RNA sequence: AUACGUUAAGUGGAAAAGGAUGUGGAGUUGCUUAGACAACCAGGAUGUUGGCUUAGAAGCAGCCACCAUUUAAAGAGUGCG
């Protein structure tokens, strides 16, 4: 999903930045996320 | 939903917000409270929003604290009505706000739990917002 | 491995043990005389069993004592403890009782001491509300 | 608590040219390489011991330093042992045989499947369900094991197509 | 750091009374295997015997600075050190043996320790 | 042009609530060569799912007294089940 205030949901989310844009990744594929 | 049980005149000027607070700055009735960085209206229906977001996640707890009653009224002119011909009526009510002021306070809470309750009202409050802890030097 | 709580006094019917240790391999015609034998001393009882399965089909099975806590009814006198332990005292017992109780429990129990053994039982007696004195 | 400061010894037999600017050409029994390397970084040749060094502690550097050595370990292993990528079809009607060099794919589409190897690299077919890349170089063994992945991408719901060996693709519940 | 000070006091006073010890690695070290071990204990006594794996270099070659000198090779990899208070020695140089060769646990072919000035061969 | 820096996006040369291991400085503090964060090899509690329950559900319907022992260590429970 993409939305402007990408936050982690559970502990297993991880915060990185990738080519200008800030995205959340987790072993969970709904939690994956990416500002921008 | 706070509305005064009575007031000396229905209308009033909206004002001219500057400077620092007049007083209150210092949380002291509550452990922790919400300290405004700037200064902007709040109307009655924001600050109900605040209050229901944080006796949900508290569950059982200390009494919610509200420094801040409302008081000033917000003109609010018909739509497609002509400029002039009269001043509008008062649709509801606004608080006036200062930088620095402690908008809201919590006690009796654990620290975990207080983090939270500061932040779910800083989202309802239009103005930017930070974590605040009672001083004792004292 | 598979842990059962086959009745003291009976083991034959399929609904209780049957397929589920017939899968197994074991051979339960041969062993069902075994559960009544040495079970017999303690009749009219649930009685849990472990069960090792070696790969020569030969088995070794180890009994059980009856469920703790069930006797802190009994000392306590009464048939049902508190569903608000501590908030709501409803029964007492010496601790003189306990060590009756304590010295049933040690083939089950893996405690070290007869001491310890005291001190595993105290944290079930709790549970039940009931006061230790 | 670091990553290129540490040293890498050199099990033999492996020569290793220091020629500019920078070009590294490792040489061996089982093949060649000939990394890039900017300038700024310093590899240099203790006696049967790679060595690399940071020009400085600013961040940029901090972070190519590490790469230089996790390259030239790279390189000297493929150079030795070699290295190689399982990979697991599973399915029923599902198999894999070479024509020549070409390795043909019975893959589940009606189109038939066929990948070519670059040269240095091979690929026996010891099983129909097992598949081996042998090859000197990580970065490619990598990317014909990424090629071969893209004929089939793996189904969340069934064991299909490739797969690596080991690793559990999520379970999923029809109806 | 006083908390490790009690880790080091405590046992050797156990060492300055201590009769006979064995070496024992931790790998694989089951918990079932573990209890089989302390059951043991419970037989020869009680509480006096320790399984303590404060193995570190660091930690209890320190403890043998004072007594049993011949630690020093026997530092590397992973140690479980056992201490005797009172039982006369016998069946705890045995027992453990008894229990590597039945699977659990890598004896470590038994590097041993403090009996007299001597090393490997348990009896 | 000179000297100390900062910025990497063309910001400079267009705004916001909000979001982020962006980066440069300053301060506070936990642990730390009687041993730190990464690991890679070790094990995971004992009575016990323990009370009150829901057909049964034992780390987990959920409400909790959520006890004490084995001890190098582990909550009668962090989590995917």
Same mark, same amino acid.
């Given at each position: 999903?993409?939305?402007?205030?990408?936050?982690?949901?559970?502990?297993?989310?991880?915060?990185?930045?990738?080519?200008?844009?800030?995205?959340?990744?987790?072993?969970?594929? *709904?939690?994956?996320?990416?500002?921008? | 939903?706070?509305?005064?049980?009575?007031?000396?005149?229905?209308?009033?000027?909206?004002?001219?917000?500057?400077?620092?607070?007049?007083?209150?700055?210092?949380?002291?009735?509550?452990?922790?409270?919400?300290?405004?960085?700037?200064?902007?209206?709040?109307?009655?229906?924001?600050?109900?929003?605040?209050?229901?977001?944080?006796?949900?996640?508290?569950?059982?707890?200390?009494?919610?604290?509200?420094?801040?009653?409302?008081?000033?009224?917000?003109?609010?002119?018909?739509?497609?009505?002509?400029?002039?011909?009269?001043?509008?009526?008062?649709?509801?009510?606004?608080?006036?706000?200062?930088?620095?002021?402690?908008?809201?306070?919590?006690?009796?809470?654990?620290?975990?739990?207080?983090?939270?309750?500061?932040?779910?009202?800083?989202?309802?409050?239009?103005?930017?917002? *930070?974590?605040?802890?009672?001083?004792?030097?004292? | 491995?598979?842990?059962?709580?086959?009745?003291?006094?009976?083991?034959?019917?399929?609904?209780?043990?049957?397929?589920?240790?017939?899968?197994?391999?074991?051979?339960?015609?041969?062993?069902?005389?075994?559960?009544?034998?040495?079970? $017999?001393?303690?009749?009219?009882?649930?009685?849990?069993?472990?069960?090792?399965?070696?790969?020569?089909?030969?088995? %070794?099975?180890?009994?059980?004592?009856?469920?703790?806590?069930?006797?802190?009814?009994?000392?306590?006198?009464?048939?049902?403890?508190?569903?608000?332990?501590?908030?709501?005292?409803?029964?007492?017992?010496?601790?003189?009782?306990?060590?009756?109780?304590?010295?049933?429990?040690?083939?089950?129990?893996?405690?070290?001491?007869?001491?310890?053994?005291?001190?595993?039982?105290?944290?079930?007696?709790?549970?039940?509300?009931?006061?230790?004195? | 608590?670091?990553?290129?400061?540490?040293?890498?010894?050199?099990?033999?037999?492996?020569?290793?040219?220091?020629?500019?600017?920078?070009?590294?050409?490792?040489?061996?029994?089982?093949?060649?390489?000939?990394?890039?390397?900017?300038?700024?970084?310093?590899?240099?040749?203790?006696?049967?011991?790679?060595?690399?060094?940071?020009?400085?502690?600013?961040?940029?550097?901090?972070?190519?330093?590490?790469? %230089?050595?996790?390259?030239?370990?790279?390189?000297? @292993?493929?150079?030795?042992?070699?290295?190689?990528?399982?990979?697991?079809?599973?399915?029923?009607?599902?198999?894999?045989?070479?024509?020549?060099?070409?390795?043909?794919?019975?893959?589940?589409?009606?189109?038939?499947?066929?990948?070519?190897?670059?040269?240095?690299?091979?690929?026996?077919?010891?099983?129909?369900?097992?598949?081996?890349?042998?090859?000197?170089?990580?970065?490619?063994?990598?990317?014909?094991? $990424?090629?071969?992945?893209?004929?089939?991408?793996?189904?969340?719901? *069934?064991?299909?197509?490739?797969?690596?060996?080991?690793?559990?693709?999520?379970?999923?519940?029809?109806? | 750091?006083?908390?490790?000070?009690?880790?080091?006091? @405590?046992?050797?006073?156990?060492?300055?009374?201590?009769?006979?010890?064995?070496?024992?690695?931790?790998?694989?070290?089951?918990?079932?295997?573990?209890?089989?071990?302390?059951?043991?204990?419970?037989?020869?006594?009680?509480?006096?015997?320790?399984?303590?794996?404060?193995?570190?270099?660091?930690?209890?070659?320190?403890? $043998?600075?004072?007594?049993?000198?011949?630690?020093?090779?026997?530092?590397?990899?992973?140690?479980?050190?056992?201490?005797?208070?009172?039982?006369?020695?016998?069946?705890?140089?045995?027992?453990?043996?008894?229990?590597?060769?039945?699977?659990?646990?890598?004896?470590?072919?038994?590097?041993?320790?403090?009996?007299?000035?001597?090393?490997?061969?348990?009896?």
């Amino acid at each position: 999903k993409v939305r402007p205030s990408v936050k982690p949901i559970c502990e297993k989310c991880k915060v990185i930045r990738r080519k200008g844009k800030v995205m959340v990744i987790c072993e969970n594929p *709904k939690h994956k996320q990416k500002q921008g | 939903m706070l509305l005064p049980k009575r007031v000396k005149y229905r209308r009033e000027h909206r004002g001219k917000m500057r400077g620092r607070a007049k007083g209150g700055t210092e949380v002291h009735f509550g452990e922790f409270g919400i300290q405004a960085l700037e200064a902007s209206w709040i109307t009655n229906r924001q600050i109900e929003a605040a209050r229901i977001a944080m006796t949900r996640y508290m569950k059982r707890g200390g009494k919610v604290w509200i420094k801040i009653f409302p008081s000033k009224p917000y003109t609010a002119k018909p739509l497609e009505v002509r400029m002039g011909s009269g001043k509008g009526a008062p649709e509801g009510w606004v608080a006036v706000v200062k930088p620095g002021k402690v908008l809201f306070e919590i006690s009796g809470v654990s620290e975990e739990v207080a983090r939270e309750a500061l932040r779910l009202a800083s989202h309802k409050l239009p103005i930017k917002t *930070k974590f605040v802890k009672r001083e004792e030097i004292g | 491995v598979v842990k059962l709580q086959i009745p003291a006094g009976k083991a034959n019917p399929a609904p209780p043990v049957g397929p589920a240790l017939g899968q197994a391999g074991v051979n339960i015609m041969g062993f069902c005389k075994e559960f009544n034998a040495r079970t $017999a001393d303690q009749a009219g009882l649930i009685i849990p069993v472990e069960i090792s399965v070696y790969e020569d089909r030969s088995f %070794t099975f180890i009994t059980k004592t009856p469920p703790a806590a069930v006797l802190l009814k009994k000392a306590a006198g009464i048939e049902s403890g508190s569903g608000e332990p501590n908030r709501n005292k409803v029964a007492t017992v010496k601790r003189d009782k306990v060590r009756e109780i304590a010295e049933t429990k040690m083939p089950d129990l893996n405690a070290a001491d007869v001491e310890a053994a005291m001190r595993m039982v105290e944290g079930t007696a709790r549970s039940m509300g009931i006061v230790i004195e | 608590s670091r990553v290129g400061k540490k040293l890498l010894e050199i099990p033999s037999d492996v020569t290793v040219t220091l020629n500019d600017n920078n070009t590294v050409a490792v040489k061996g029994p089982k093949g060649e390489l000939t990394r890039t390397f900017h300038p700024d970084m310093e590899i240099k040749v203790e006696d049967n011991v790679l060595t690399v060094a940071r020009p400085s502690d600013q961040k940029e550097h901090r972070a190519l330093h590490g790469t %230089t050595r996790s390259l030239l370990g790279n390189m000297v @292993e493929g150079v030795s042992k070699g290295f190689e990528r399982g990979l697991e079809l599973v399915g029923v009607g599902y198999r894999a045989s070479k024509s020549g060099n070409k390795l043909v794919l019975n893959v589940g589409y009606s189109h038939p499947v066929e990948i070519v190897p670059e040269e240095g690299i091979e690929i026996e077919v010891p099983s129909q369900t097992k598949v081996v890349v042998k090859g000197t170089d990580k970065e490619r063994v990598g990317a014909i094991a $990424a090629n071969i992945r893209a004929v089939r991408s793996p189904e969340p719901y *069934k064991g299909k197509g490739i797969r690596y060996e080991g690793e559990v693709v999520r379970r999923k519940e029809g109806k | 750091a006083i908390e490790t000070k009690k880790v080091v006091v @405590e046992e050797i006073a156990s060492k300055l009374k201590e009769s006979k010890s064995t070496i024992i690695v931790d790998y694989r070290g089951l918990n079932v295997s573990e209890v089989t071990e302390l059951r043991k204990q419970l037989r020869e006594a009680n509480v006096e015997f320790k399984v303590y794996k404060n193995t570190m270099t660091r930690r209890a070659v320190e403890q $043998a600075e004072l007594n049993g000198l011949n630690d020093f090779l026997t530092g590397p990899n992973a140690i479980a050190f056992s201490t005797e208070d009172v039982v006369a020695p016998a069946k705890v140089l045995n027992d453990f043996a008894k229990n590597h060769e039945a699977l659990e646990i890598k004896a470590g072919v038994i590097e041993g320790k403090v009996s007299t000035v001597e090393e490997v061969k348990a009896l």
